[PDB]
Ligand binder design. Structure first.
Ligand code: HEC
Length: 103
């Protein structure tokens, strides 16, 4: 996806609850550094719900694309209160940015 477009999407819809940089602070949600290739709920020092921690899947392009379309559907009981990015293209660009900004 388009990294530049994904960045603006992140700033507009995710930034209020997330940071992505290495050593980033946890806000409403956990810092996202190192997300790809890691199982759900593994950000150091963040208090996740049992649901996010128990999902047991590995975050990557395919799981992030599904999750971001409807967070609560993928992880019922999650405390991430966000409806999701409905457009696939917008979601793909966001994932592209996430991959670039989190490593
Ligand atoms: C606050 C109102 C939020 C907004 C807007 C977004 N997210 Fe979030 N996110 C939030 C919380 C409180 C949590 C933890 C949920 C829990 O049940 O513990 C999360 C979690 C995520 C995750 C999973 C992280 C992990 O498993 O380590 C991802 C990948 C994530 N959030 C992504 C994300 C994106 C890309 C957003 C914008 C579209 C976004 N979130 C917004 C709270 C909030």
């Amino acid at each position: 996806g388009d990294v530049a477009k994904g960045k603006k999407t992140f700033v507009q819809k995710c930034a209020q609850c997330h940071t992505v940089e290495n050593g980033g602070k946890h806000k409403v949600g956990p810092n996202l550094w190192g997300l790809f290739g890691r199982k759900t709920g593994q950000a150091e020092g963040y208090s996740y719900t049992d649901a996010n921690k128990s999902k047991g899947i590995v975050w990557n392009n395919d799981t992030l694309m599904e999750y971001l379309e409807n967070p609560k559907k993928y992880i019922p009981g999650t405390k991430m209160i966000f409806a999701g990015i409905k457009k696939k293209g917008e979601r793909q660009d966001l994932v592209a940015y996430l991959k670039s900004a989190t490593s």
